[PDB]
Subunit: 26 residues, 27 copies
Amino acid sequence: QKLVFFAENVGSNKGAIIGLMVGGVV
Amino acid sequence: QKLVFFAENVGSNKGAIIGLMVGGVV
Amino acid sequence: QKLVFFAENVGSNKGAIIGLMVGGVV
Amino acid sequence: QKLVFFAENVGSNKGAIIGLMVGGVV
Amino acid sequence: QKLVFFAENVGSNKGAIIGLMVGGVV
Amino acid sequence: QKLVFFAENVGSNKGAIIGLMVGGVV
Amino acid sequence: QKLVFFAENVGSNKGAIIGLMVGGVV
Amino acid sequence: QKLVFFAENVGSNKGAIIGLMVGGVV
Amino acid sequence: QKLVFFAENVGSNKGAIIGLMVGGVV
Amino acid sequence: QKLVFFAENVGSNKGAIIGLMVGGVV
Amino acid sequence: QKLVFFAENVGSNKGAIIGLMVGGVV
Amino acid sequence: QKLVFFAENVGSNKGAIIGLMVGGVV
Amino acid sequence: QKLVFFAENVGSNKGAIIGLMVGGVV
Amino acid sequence: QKLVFFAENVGSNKGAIIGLMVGGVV
Amino acid sequence: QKLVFFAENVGSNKGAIIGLMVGGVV
Amino acid sequence: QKLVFFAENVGSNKGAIIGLMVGGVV
Amino acid sequence: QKLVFFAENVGSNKGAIIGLMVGGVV
Amino acid sequence: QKLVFFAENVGSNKGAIIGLMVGGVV
Amino acid sequence: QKLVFFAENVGSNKGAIIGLMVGGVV
Amino acid sequence: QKLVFFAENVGSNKGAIIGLMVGGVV
Amino acid sequence: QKLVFFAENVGSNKGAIIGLMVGGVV
Amino acid sequence: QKLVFFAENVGSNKGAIIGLMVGGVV
Amino acid sequence: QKLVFFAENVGSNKGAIIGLMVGGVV
Amino acid sequence: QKLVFFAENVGSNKGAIIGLMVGGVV
Amino acid sequence: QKLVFFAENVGSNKGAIIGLMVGGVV
Amino acid sequence: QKLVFFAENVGSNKGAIIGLMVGGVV
Amino acid sequence: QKLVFFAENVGSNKGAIIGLMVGGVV
């Protein structure tokens, strides 16, 4: 009903690794 | 009902890796 | 009902890898 | 009902890879 | 009902790869 | 019903590794 | 019913490693 | 019914390692 | 029914190692 | 050799979304 | 050799979402 | 060789979400 | 060689969520 | 060689969540 | 060689959560 | 070679939570 | 070679929680 | 070679909690 | 720049099933 | 830049099933 | 930049099942 | 940058089952 | 950057089952 | 950066079962 | 950075069962 | 940074069972 | 940083059973 994904990488050499899975609600 | 995807990479050498899957709601 | 995709890569060498899949709502 | 796709790559060597699929809403 | 596709690549060597598919709404 | 994902990495060398899976509610 | 994920790493050399799995409620 | 995950690492060299699994409630 | 995870590491060299598993309630 | 597709929606507000692909038999 | 697809939604508000793919037989 | 898909939703408010993929037989 | 999928939801408010994948037989 | 999937939910408020994956036989 | 999945929920408020994975036989 | 899964919940308020994984036979 | 899973809950308020994993035979 | 799992709860308020893991035979 | 597709089936009853898709290079 | 696909099935009853997808390079 | 796929099945009854997907490099 | 896939099955009754996925490099 | 997959089965009755997934490097 | 997978089964009745997953490096 | 997987089974009746998972390094 | 997996079974009736998991380093 | 796994079984009837898990270092 509401999908808010916030990811930022500032002032680094490498970035981040993000795995997000959402589902399975009755 | 609401898809808000926010991703940014500023001031780096590499970027980020983002995997996002959403679904499965009744 | 609302698709807001925000992605930017500024001041880097490489870009980012983004996989986003949304669907499966009743 | 509303498709807002925002992607930009500024000041880099490589660009980004973006895969976005949305659908499956009743 | 509203298709807004925004993509730009400025100041790079390579461009970006964007795959976007939207549909499946009742 | 409500997906709020907040992740940021600021002032580092490496980024973070985040794995998040949510689902299985009746 | 409510997913609030908060993670940040500020002023470091390395980031964090976070594994979170939630599901199995009747 | 309520997922509140709070993790932060500020003013360090290394980050933290967090493994959290919740589920199995009837 | 209520998941409140609070972990922070401030003013250190190393972070913490946290393993938390909850489930098995009828 | 035999294609029988049966789909009906009666007494509703919304209809259904059906994707069916069949092929790859030797 | 035989494709029998049966789907119906009767006496509801929303319909169903059905994805079916069959193929890869030698 | 034989595809029999049976799905029905009768006397409800919401419908069901069904994903079925079959293939990979030698 | 034989695909028999049977799913029905009768006399409810919500429907069911079914994910079925079959393949990988030599 | 034989796929028999049987699932039904009768006389309830919520439905069920079923994930079934079969494959990897030589 | 033989897949027989039997699940039913009759005369309840909530349904069940079933995760079944089978494969890895030589 | 033979998969027989039997699960039923009759005359209750809540359903059951079943996780079954089988594989790793040579 | 033979998978027989039998679980039932009849005449209760809550259901059961069953975790079964089998594999690792040479 | 032979998996026979038998569990039932009849005439109770709560169900049972069963964890069974079998594997590691050469 | 160079597309070399080689497939042959000799001395059999059935043929093969080959799906090959290549593209997405900048 | 270079696509070399080599597949052959010689002296058999059944053929092979090959799915190959390549793309997503910047 | 270089795609070399080598698969062959010689002197058998059944063939092989090969799924290969490559992509996601910046 | 370099994809070398080597698979062969010689002098057998059954073939092999190979699943290979590579991608997610920045 | 370099994908070298080597698998062979010679002088057997059954083949092997290989699952390989590689990705998630920044 | 370097993927070297070596697996062979020679002079046997059954083959081997290999599951290999690599990823999560920053 | 370097993936070297070496597994072989020579002069046996059964093969081996190998499960290897590597990842979670910052 | 360096994954060296060495396993072999030579001159036996049964093979070995190896489970190896490595990860969780900051 | 360095994963060296060495296991071999030579001149036997049965093989060995090895379970190795390493991780949790900051």
